[PDB]
Design a protein around this ligand. Sequence first.
Ligand SMILES: CCn1nccc1-c1c[nH]c2ncc(-c3ccc(N)c(C(=O)N(C)C)c3)cc12
Length: 263
Amino acid sequence: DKWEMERTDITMKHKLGQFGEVYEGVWKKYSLTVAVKTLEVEEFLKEAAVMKEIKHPNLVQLLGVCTREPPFYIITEFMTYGNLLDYLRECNRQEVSAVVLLYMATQISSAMEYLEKKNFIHRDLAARNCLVGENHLVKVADFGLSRLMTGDTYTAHAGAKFPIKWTAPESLAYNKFSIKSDVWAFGVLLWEIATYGMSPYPGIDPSQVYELLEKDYRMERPEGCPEKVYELMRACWQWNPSDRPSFAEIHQAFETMFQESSI
Ligand SMILES: CCn1nccc1-c1c[nH]c2ncc(-c3ccc(N)c(C(=O)N(C)C)c3)cc12
């Protein structure tokens, strides 16, 4: 297809390794700095297939694939400032102000509304899996997206391990994932943003989080976080998946807040 590329079109500059086999590269023809994911086989090739169907300003854009013979490449745009978590921790808070925080939440929710619309599920939404470009542009990392009709559920493989503090209670107890477990994770992401990259449930060991969530314990409102934003967080953390808002509802709320904060 139009996506298929020659391996020799790209030269690798620097290895980037929390994301795995991921490199900074050069698309020589365009003098363009790119990101390259290299390599099981069938899972990797499906990743590439799904990414061909993703087209949104706030999801990392696929540029090309090398899938004919090993070693296999997935080539995407390069996000200059790296992951959002480290970006928030290291930022100038006078530059990355409250309105900027709303702007980033609006961008992420836009991408998630798109996935909700297009029957995709993320399953690993967190600040570490969002990427930052110039001028506070934020894009959701989309290399591990899966096909799932919005409303349907996925049952994780036996012995699966999750990032507990981002993981919805139905996922923790029953290994069940849906768009609503993404909504839960987004709530935790909101908290990460509001705190400029604090670790969620600070001091609480992961193995004790589920029992607390049962008892209706939730994280308290972060310092300086608007009540409207915290109410959205808490709506995302509703015990019953069906009681949580949709990303369409969430995006509309943030877009309104961002427009009002600008005016
Ligand atoms: C498919 C390729 N891929 N797999 C995972 C992420 C990306 C990626 C795509 N586009 C990217 N654009 C930029 C970066 C990037 C750049 C600099 C950085 N310091 C970091 C960073 O946060 N650290 C801690 C290594 C991340 C990663 C990706």
